[PDB]
Ligand binder design. Structure first.
Ligand code: NA
Ligand code: NA
Ligand SMILES: [Zn+2]
Ligand SMILES: [Zn+2]
Ligand SMILES: [Zn+2]
Ligand SMILES: [Zn+2]
Lengths: 292, 292
């Protein structure tokens, strides 16, 4: 059941748990994500960045997801455009079959962000698609978020509270503005989204370095911070970097330990398993396990 | 378009060229194979082994190919079950949407090979699907191939004339029994198939070794032997190993040269390019280029 994103996140919002939003760029990532949701009895947010869409072609992005949905028809799945940069990108996703779209205009001033988001909302809602937007870069102004949500009719909001994409989130100590998060939640009363929510667990780090990799003083969000975010009102947790490190760690490993290995399945089967286990543990941490 | 295997190979049979049959196991391989055919204006034989089908799941194997065919509707495409081992496996491929199936019973005596092949043919032909079979392991008996084709009504035949799967084809010197090939072709007058037809070209071996890989003194079929096979009557040229070596060569290269790289596209975009170039060259070598 491919469903509009709001169907999944309104439930998480009402019941106070978080739904991981897991990026993919090919079949091995998608397969591992679905198997995780199947084994944890967890709803799924599947995300594709504009770059991943260009890599796969939007027809294959939607095509593979729809195939996976028929394979696991009992799992609620939303297919979400991650960090859409233009109205036209969001519209193309809508037409291709995406059930959720994010328009990121947090770099514009409030008035232009609200205007562009409202335009996307009008377009997507007319097609039965949910919309995500972003406020803050500079942390979110809770009073701006209140008006933004009322004016735009956006389904969920990503408030900046101290996170950032990538493996290098903090060059000092991890800190998130939970008081700010709670204020936004109180004033907006909608599902909230956490961007840059990869944690880089110790076991995933160990596997990557044990394979000769280098994470350049990386630092992710601690598990207790993710747990505190969900308590504060986060319901969608964007997760990408964790999946990639776990995956490539195993590819590096196979390459190192057998120089005559060129069967793709021998590289990517252990890579899928490692990615899947990250997703499974994240679903348990966030509280979406056993929610189907 | 997605068409019966015989539609492609009968044309190649009557015109005297070879159509590469390229194996895939995931989206990256399929995409690079398709881009190769689009750029050479070549018909495509897309192959999936039973192992590949188990890895992808047959619904995804077919689903991805149909997406690709709609992306390049001008390219004749057959989707082929490579080395089917049971009737039931061939039957599942037929039901899933394969347009060509191979039943490999060449390890049985003639009567048992003929019986199992005839059963598959009856089922596949009833569903508008073409069938490949195999004779020889001792090399093919041409008079036996004659009666095998006449009795079974199989669409194309793989006669054993010296090749073998994998990168360890020739422990000594490459040698194919072209006289035996010509006799089979004279007596059967159908499209013929060459198994284990990877060449392991110099540039691909160079790339793999430079990436720290070990090929273990591998030896493929020389380009001259492949062209002579086509002249002798080979119309379908099974090619797998060359694609995987070229692909994994690039993967190994990205891992060696940047230990902090875990973006999957940075690994597989060059891998796709290398695989695509092998295919394009093979299409030109075999004579399928510019045949659409
Ligand atoms: Na997003
Ligand atoms: Na075959
Ligand atoms: Zn983000
Ligand atoms: Zn963001
Ligand atoms: Zn073979
Ligand atoms: Zn064979």
């Amino acid at each position: 059941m491919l469903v509009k994103g709001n169907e999944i996140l309104l439930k998480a919002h009402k019941e106070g748990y978080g739904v991981g939003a897991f990026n993919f760029v090919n079949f091995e990532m998608l397969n591992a994500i679905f198997e995780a949701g199947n084994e944890e009895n967890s709803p799924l947010f599947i995300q594709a960045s504009e770059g991943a869409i260009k890599y796969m072609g939007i027809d294959m992005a939607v095509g593979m997801v729809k195939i996976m949905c028929e394979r696991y028809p009992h799992i609620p799945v939303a297919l979400h455009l991650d960090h859409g940069t233009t109205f036209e990108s969001c519209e193309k996703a809508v037409k291709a079959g995406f059930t959720s779209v994010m328009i990121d205009a947090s770099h514009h001033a409030f008035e232009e962000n609200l205007e562009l988001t409202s335009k996307v909302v009008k377009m997507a809602h007319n097609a039965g698609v949910s919309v995500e937007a972003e406020l803050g870069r500079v942390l979110v102004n809770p009073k701006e978020a209140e008006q933004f949500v009322k004016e735009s009719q956006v389904d969920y909001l990503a408030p900046a509270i101290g996170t950032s994409q990538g493996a290098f989130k903090f060059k000092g100590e991890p800190k998130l503005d939970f008081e700010r998060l709670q204020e936004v939640k109180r004033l907006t009363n909608i599902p909230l989204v956490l961007h840059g929510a990869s944690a880089i667990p110790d076991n995933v780090r160990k596997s990557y370095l044990d394979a000769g990799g280098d994470l350049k003083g990386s630092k992710g969000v601690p598990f207790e911070f993710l747990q505190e975010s969900v308590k504060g009102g986060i319901n969608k947790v964007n997760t990408d970097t964790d999946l990639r490190i776990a995956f490539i760690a195993e590819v590096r490993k196979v390459a190192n330990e057998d120089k005559s290995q060129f069967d793709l399945r021998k590289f990517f089967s252990p890579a899928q398993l490692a990615l899947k286990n990250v997703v499974k543990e994240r679903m348990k941490l966030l509280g979406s396990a056993n929610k189907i």
